[model samples]
Target: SLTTSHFIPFPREMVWDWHTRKGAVARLTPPFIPLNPITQAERLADGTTIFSLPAGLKWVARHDLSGFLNGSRFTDVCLTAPVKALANWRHVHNFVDQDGGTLITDSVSTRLPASTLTGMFAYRQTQLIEDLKFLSRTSTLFDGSPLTVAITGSRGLVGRALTAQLQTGGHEVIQLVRKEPKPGKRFWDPLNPASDLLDGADVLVHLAGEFNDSHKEAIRESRVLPTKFLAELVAESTQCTTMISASAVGFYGHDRGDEILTEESESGDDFLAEVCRDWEHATAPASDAGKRVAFIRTGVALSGRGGMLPLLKTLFSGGKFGDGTSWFSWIAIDDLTDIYYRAIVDAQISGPINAVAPNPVSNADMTKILATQGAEELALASQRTAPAALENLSHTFRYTDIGAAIAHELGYEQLADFAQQQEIEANLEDPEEVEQSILSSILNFRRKRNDLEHHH
Candidate 1:
């Protein structure tokens, strides 16, 4: 493994607080090496590296650097033990004084494979660097002030996880549901100006959309129309600290190259891309009003309980959809939710962030990894191969590919998971595709492990 570190001239306390906070450190860590707490974290303490994740991943790193106590000068540095295999391999993170503020420097070695072939290979480093730099700005909001945060798609997988994260940070979440106001729920009509939902909101996250099948009409209605409406809404409203509009890397369409796409890349002409482009632009009001705007272009999110993960698992168990090597871009629901937490707090960050990891895999790889749980074997030929039926399955494959691509570019990954909505279940995906995966599709070919083992 390679080791590296950087120095920050800011006060040790400032760096310590921002790096240790929930949603803060998770956001500040290199985006690809996402940091999340598996359980409740302890408050800061001396030599604590206080923000610790599962398996003892350190958030606020404290090395044996000289002069670290006074928060002023540092002479020598060292990247010591346990930090191996982590991003800061053999590295040190330091801070010293500069003209106006702290002179921040992250200096360390990159822990990579020794073979030149392996060293030459590039992963999602750009996104990681950008995320770390972005972390440099969140400490300013460290005061425990409550802010009004409006979440448009409150019931969504990422949205719900974000809501939970926000609550953990002591912020209130007002869901911007398009429905009429219920006792526990607030109401807003995106199509009607009388909605009054945008009032007094410190931040607005627009995620409302109509879900549809692969039909052209469903795609258009679910994507274009509502986005156009929402963008106008944010453009007119003013009481927002920022606006985070949801989009998809599908905006770049499907990948035709080995190179990863960044936020600066142009979008593809596919239906997904068109929908995402419009969806991202919906927050013109927030952008124009000088409020921070972030377009969360998401990818395939995997989970064990539901979504395509279970569906794919069933097909693999039955030997229906075998390991066809279609590359998949994915983000765990946990990471996707954590991103919203980051966007809500981080002030320096704006614009599109690919909510995915950089290392994409094949459907076969995905299926095989999952097959260990409860899989039945069948000869590849015994599996059904209907064209008219598969036209839809191909659609699932395409979305998976998009997810994998996005994750690879964005620099993070997570396994399959799920969140319930109004007691009804759905994939953390755009929500429009959830029903089609469950109901509208015609074939049902799930194989229990015992059933497949006997047949094979």
Candidate 2:
């Protein structure tokens, strides 16, 4: 047998959070202990200890906390244990103050005989390695810079990313939700003329669109009406900061006969172009209220599942889209997420900026890359059942390119290439792996949805 040690320098409470939180052990574990919680607290019946793994294995181990070593060390010895390897073992957990924080050490020693270990060998070293790796990743504390963001639509994609990045940077991120909650979870609607959701906000990111992409009402709800409403919300704000809002590159109106368009580019006379111009104009209150306004002329964002990536992946995967020659300005998901972060903190960036990457590829090139990279399952999706598929594909370019443009402006150049942004590969290459991914994805979606739902 071999002996190993894991010294964790943190308080016990932090240690517990590391062990239980999602993605905490991905760097540490051998990818087999499973990601879901053990649910021991929920399943425990009276004094009995119960444990269940994803593989349907059942074990009942009992323990009695006899005493302690150092001030923070906890010692628990097995009592009527049913596990084979640790029939008579002692578990020790210790936390000692280190330079700036605490150091934790988990040690276990078994007194049980090695049943038949003379010539043959059987061990669970993989499990032990994974557990320790998880410990290592979770104990680490990441530090970064501070940011002050002003955004409209602070409840949408760009907004969510901005808030998270600000928080991660140890800065302040204030959102303007349509309805904010009171101390006792009381709802306060913003649509009402006198409602107050935007008060002392440092930055205002207006993205209050109702994304129901079908009828005129839906479009207005998603893009037009929300921008206007949020602009009004910004008018009521007392805090002074930069304000950034959405504006489509369609302002140039979809491929203007090869006229090189820049910041001084002219908008189209079409419906979307008019909407874009009106959208920028709608921010008068914020601009008049003494705020630096930036209108991000967005292009596209490509991903494996949502927005236009999945639709394009399906179309290109089946060779469905005919003669795909449309220009595509794309950005990776993380790139877009981080762009919002940088935009909020970097106070120097203001005014109208092209939200696009240095290199904007054609739709044909985008489809070809996706097709060659094994995104064929997207075509197998029943479009008849998923009517929103092809239509939403058009915006893929906008989301990606706009995200890239923002990152470029903010100077976050560590974005990954399209080849590396294949999040659906785990499901495509390995179907069995999909179940766990799907379950975990669903769980995460629930957590995020809960964050929004519970807030109001």
Candidate 3:
């Protein structure tokens, strides 16, 4: 027998409710382990919840109502085992109220020897602490009932970040993956998605596709075909009322030079432009079905991971990719994630929305900003008219300055490096406070820029 425990800085009732959430098990599962939950714990009439593990193993936990006197507790036993020698696998979960927080303990008795149990229990305790803090941070953001969002491309950079953000906000995320179905994930064949694929989902966000510019056939097949399939699937869904798809500013073409492009601008005659046109057209079924459909025409997503920014940072850091005369439209990765959130909740947004910051810079300016050189050779492109539709959006961008965005990315990298130095604890602040502070800072930044422009 072995036991593990941890103290979480949240009330017992909140911790209990978090564990009972729909995606709890999947969120708690460690990424390094091969174990996956096939069935989440569902409360039964007899107060026992039965869940399934991989390889024909099942776990059944019975609630101990009497433990409510102290806090709350449950006991579990493995119903089936792959190894015949493994026996008496009974685990007890105990939650105790201490001060204003909760003390969680897990006690397990098994005949498989004490060697493996120690590491297992330690992992479980760490998961409990981290996941609880995540839920706490998210619960403070939005005011509404939790929603179930069905998302494709669950493993991509934008997909993974959005999923974590949505989860923190107490929304249920159903990942549509190509792999085998797990507890909170559904397997969908790109060519033939099931009609009821989004049956219970409140929103459908399509972000799956090859993002690179190479291979014309691969790019066309990944975006145009699967989106058409998912759009058709969403049309038949009883609960789904909103559909959001990823598009690109490349719809305006590769080199418009200095043309001010808007959502109403004509499509450009280029490879990516043609692809974006067809990719967005594939969502006609959802629109025809009377669902609110939105297309996010994104600019260069600035991030250290998986985007043109990293490659550009490497090139431009060495004073490359600069002729000092081309327009470079960009949005910070943080702002892009927020735009996706708006597409999900904002009903007024139905058609093409330009997902970029207000300011657009030239190639030379961007290179100089990143390379830490003099800013004289840097020139501004002709200012395009602001996309009127997105002008009224509630969520505004934070980093309109290219230099500021780069600095923020560097700071984030330092924070990540610090995390790698030690075990990760709950370091995020409440989403409400953080969001308010961010918006205030952005407003001040923009106001100062306006004053400077006026003075000049």
Q: Against the true structure, candidate 2 has what lDDT?
A: 0.43
Candidate 3 structure quality by residue, lDDT tens digits, 1-456: 444445678899888766655555554443334444544455311155554445677555554443233236655555455544333465556676655787666555565543454444444555456455534533344455789999998777677667765764578889999887787688888988876779789999998864235766886677788999899888888799999999888787767776788888888777767888999999999999999999988877776545666566555435534466677777876667667876786677789888887777877677677777222322322223244467764444656677766655433212111221233322122325433433443344346547868998
Q: Could you give candidate 1's per-residue lDDT for residues 15-125 as a string of tens digits?
A: 544444444333333222334333323332223233344475554444444324344322222244445444443232334443333333332344444221121112212
For candidate 2, report its TM-score: 0.49
Which numbered prediction scores highest in lDDT against the true structure? 3
Tell me how far the alpha carbon of residue 401 in candidate 1 is from the true structure, in angstroms, after superposition.
16
Checking candidate 3 for backbone clashes, the offending pairs are 138-168
TM-score of each: 0.49, 0.49, 0.59
Comparing candidate 1 with candidate 2, which one achieves the higher lDDT? Answer: 1
Residue 6 CA error for candidate 3 (Å)? 24
Candidate 2 lDDT for residue 452: 66
Candidates' C-alpha lDDT: 0.48, 0.43, 0.65
